[PDB]
């Protein structure tokens with residue numbers, strides 16, 4: 001029923017009042033890039049102004065950085081035209097955070113989303129395996145209901161329980177329309193959501209959770225798909 005746009009989360013005090021009434025999810029620390037709890041160029045021919053003006057993608061699907069799921073930096077041959085700097089430029093798709101029937105809050109497209117469209121980066125606190133297991137028990141002790149863990153690399157798990165952005169609201173489906181992709185940005189790995197098919201406006205954005213924390217009971221899955229696994 002209730003819904004809200006990405007920008008409603010910039011203002012903290014207005015947010016806590018909307019949350020106090022149930023028109024926005026509960027407060028968390030909004031951040032722009034991953035926070036660690038313990039701390040070359042491509043070959044694309046630069047585009048001329050004509051081909052720029054008439055609609056040519058700079059650093060298209062044949063870009064060497066894009067192929068290795070590396071993002072270009074400042075020094076790219078196309079400079080400002082580079083379409084391969086989506087994480088750094090926060091070129092996120094238009095999405096809204098909405099109340100679902102029983103999964104809690106969720107993400108839905110506010111515009112049509114073509115296939116293999118960048119949706120959002122999944123930000124949060126990065127933990128090693130020791131910190132991760134520490135919080136799994138802190139969160140079972142606090143009877144948390146929603147969990148916000150995302151596998152990044154060996155000895156790196158992303159935890160958006162406390163700090164993150166609106167990507168933390170994407171819910172599970174056994175028949176998803178999104179996936180995670182790991183991208184290198186300045187020598188460092190981040191993960192983001194990408195649509196795996198055309199998502200029509202209004203439709204809820206979902207991906208297929210593949211995380212193992214386990215023990216503390218299992219959660220039933222309300223995705224409502226034809227072939228639902230039954231649980232998360």
Ligand SMILES: Nc1ncnc2c1ncn2[C@@H]1O[C@H](CSCC[C@H](N)C(=O)O)[C@@H](O)[C@H]1O
Pocket residue numbers: 025102103104105106145146147148168169170171172173219220221222223
């Ligand atoms: N398909 C599904 N069925 C039941 N619960 C789901 C679900 N997908 C996501 N969830 C819930 O959402 C949590 C993941 S975090 C996703 C955002 C969450 N819906 C929220 O309001 O904050 C899970 O721990 C689970 O509680």
Ligand SMILES: [Zn+2]
Pocket residue numbers: 042043044058059060063064065066072084
């Ligand atoms: Zn390139």
Ligand SMILES: [Zn+2]
Pocket residue numbers: 042044058059063065072073076077078082083084
């Ligand atoms: Zn580039």
Ligand SMILES: [Zn+2]
Pocket residue numbers: 173174175221222223224225227228229230231
């Ligand atoms: Zn399901």
